[PDB]
Motif scaffolding. Sequence first.
Motif, short mmCIF file in Angstrom:
data_model
loop_
_atom_site.label_atom_id
_atom_site.label_comp_id
_atom_site.label_asym_id
_atom_site.label_seq_id
_atom_site.Cartn_x
_atom_site.Cartn_y
_atom_site.Cartn_z
N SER A 1 1.17 4.55 2.14
CA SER A 1 0.74 5.17 3.37
C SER A 1 0.95 6.69 3.31
CB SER A 1 1.48 4.58 4.55
OG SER A 1 1.24 3.19 4.70
N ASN B 1 10.03 0.61 0.86
CA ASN B 1 10.34 1.78 1.66
C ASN B 1 11.77 2.34 1.48
OD1 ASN B 1 8.14 0.25 3.69
ND2 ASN B 1 8.11 2.45 3.68
N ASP B 2 12.63 1.60 0.83
CA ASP B 2 13.97 2.07 0.54
C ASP B 2 14.08 2.57 -0.90
OD1 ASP B 2 15.42 -0.76 2.16
OD2 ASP B 2 14.75 1.14 3.03
N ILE C 1 -3.22 0.41 13.99
CA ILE C 1 -2.73 -0.26 12.76
C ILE C 1 -3.88 -0.59 11.79
CG2 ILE C 1 -1.49 -2.28 11.84
CD1 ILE C 1 0.07 -2.34 14.54
N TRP D 1 7.70 1.03 12.53
CA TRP D 1 6.55 1.94 12.45
C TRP D 1 5.91 2.28 13.82
CZ3 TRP D 1 7.87 3.42 8.11
CH2 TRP D 1 8.21 2.54 7.10
N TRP D 2 5.76 1.30 14.72
CA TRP D 2 4.70 1.38 15.72
C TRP D 2 5.19 1.62 17.15
CZ3 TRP D 2 0.84 2.52 13.04
CH2 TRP D 2 0.67 1.98 11.77
N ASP E 1 9.58 -7.69 15.25
CA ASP E 1 8.14 -7.85 15.50
C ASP E 1 7.89 -8.31 16.94
OD1 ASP E 1 7.75 -7.20 12.81
OD2 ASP E 1 6.88 -9.15 12.26
N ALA F 1 8.78 -3.90 2.98
CA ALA F 1 9.95 -3.28 3.62
C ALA F 1 10.89 -2.72 2.54
CB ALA F 1 10.66 -4.27 4.49
N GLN G 1 2.52 -9.40 16.76
CA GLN G 1 3.76 -9.18 16.01
C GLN G 1 3.88 -7.81 15.40
OE1 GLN G 1 6.65 -11.92 15.49
NE2 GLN G 1 5.80 -11.42 17.50
N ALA H 1 -2.85 -5.33 7.03
CA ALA H 1 -1.61 -4.90 7.73
C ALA H 1 -0.83 -6.06 8.38
CB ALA H 1 -1.94 -3.85 8.82
N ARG I 1 -3.86 7.55 -1.69
CA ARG I 1 -3.60 6.15 -1.32
C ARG I 1 -4.26 5.19 -2.27
NH1 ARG I 1 -4.19 6.02 5.23
NH2 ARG I 1 -2.13 6.80 5.68
N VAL J 1 0.87 -1.20 0.00
CA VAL J 1 0.00 0.00 0.00
C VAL J 1 0.88 1.22 0.00
CG1 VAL J 1 -1.96 -1.20 1.13
CG2 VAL J 1 -0.26 -0.03 2.51
N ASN K 1 5.44 -4.33 14.33
CA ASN K 1 6.76 -3.99 13.82
C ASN K 1 7.36 -2.68 14.34
OD1 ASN K 1 8.54 -2.79 11.39
ND2 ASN K 1 8.84 -4.98 11.54
N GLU L 1 6.32 5.69 1.53
CA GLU L 1 6.29 4.99 2.81
C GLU L 1 5.11 4.05 2.75
OE1 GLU L 1 7.39 6.77 6.61
OE2 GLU L 1 5.35 6.30 7.28
N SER L 2 5.38 2.78 2.98
CA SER L 2 4.40 1.72 2.86
C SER L 2 4.43 0.98 4.19
CB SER L 2 4.84 0.80 1.69
OG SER L 2 3.91 -0.28 1.50
N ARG L 3 3.49 1.27 5.07
CA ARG L 3 3.45 0.68 6.40
C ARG L 3 2.72 -0.66 6.43
NH1 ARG L 3 2.63 6.43 7.63
NH2 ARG L 3 0.41 6.04 7.95
N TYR L 4 3.01 -1.42 7.46
CA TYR L 4 2.44 -2.72 7.65
C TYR L 4 2.50 -2.97 9.16
CZ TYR L 4 7.50 -2.98 6.74
OH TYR L 4 8.87 -2.72 6.70
N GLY L 5 1.70 -3.90 9.62
CA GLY L 5 1.60 -4.28 11.02
C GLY L 5 2.71 -5.19 11.40
N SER L 6 2.68 -6.40 10.88
CA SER L 6 3.81 -7.32 11.08
C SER L 6 4.72 -7.20 9.86
CB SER L 6 3.36 -8.75 11.30
OG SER L 6 2.48 -9.06 10.24
N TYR L 7 5.93 -7.70 9.98
CA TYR L 7 6.92 -7.49 8.94
C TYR L 7 6.57 -8.15 7.63
CZ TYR L 7 11.57 -7.18 6.77
OH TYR L 7 12.66 -6.85 5.97
N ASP L 8 6.69 -7.38 6.58
CA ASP L 8 6.55 -7.92 5.21
C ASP L 8 7.77 -7.53 4.39
OD1 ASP L 8 3.79 -7.88 2.90
OD2 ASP L 8 5.94 -8.11 2.40
#
Lengths: 114, 129
Positions: A31, A99-100, B98, B62-63, B52, A96, B57, B107, A60, A29, B59, A85-92
């Motif tokens: 962000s 974002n670079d 999130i 960001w958080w 995480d 990631a 989990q 997410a 977006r 996505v 990350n 900047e493309s945010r995510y909850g757990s690592y993807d």
Amino acid sequence: RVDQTPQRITKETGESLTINCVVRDSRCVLSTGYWYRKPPGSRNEESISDGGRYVETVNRGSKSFSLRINDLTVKDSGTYRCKPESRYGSYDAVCAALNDQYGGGTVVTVNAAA
Amino acid sequence: KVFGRCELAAAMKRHGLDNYRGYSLGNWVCAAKFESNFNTQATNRNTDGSTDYGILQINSRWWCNDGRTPGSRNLCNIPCSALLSSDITASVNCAKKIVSDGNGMNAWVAWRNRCKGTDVQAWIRGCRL
């Protein structure tokens, strides 16, 4: 990958310009995003962000973001790049790496007033 | 702490996650299963220098702040240690941010890969709720 257009812009003092970036990724996505300017003759790019003559737009849903610069002067000349900047909850790891990534750049020439 | 499925369902319901941002309770239980296997102390280090943390989990790029992650933000305004608690309040409050950040439960990779498009209601089957 981030597709930045136009590659080059020449404008007269007093005009406005707009630069677009589109993230070509069906998974990750958008962000927010950031903009940097490298002055003519140097290697180092420094942040530019929303405020005053600088107007940022993030879309977006289209995974695009744009920078408009109003009331241009010769001091606005340089190379501009975007960075998403493309945010995510757990690592993807895919997102990631996005974002670079930077756009390919836009070389801006603003001609002097007469 | 490792949660029971129904124990965790009960805790998440009490914390207001049933239908939060449209996601019925089983989504959240299922996300926790496949992110952390219900282990509140789960941590996993990632190639970008991030980590995480906790049952969902979350990350550190960001958080939360773990003091060691390059180019990081701390959008939930918490230390990452707070996400490793036996009480889930911190993780839930950050999960709520999130999930409201523009991508829904997409997410969480584990939700996308193992919960989305499945019968997530199964994850609360048998639970006194």
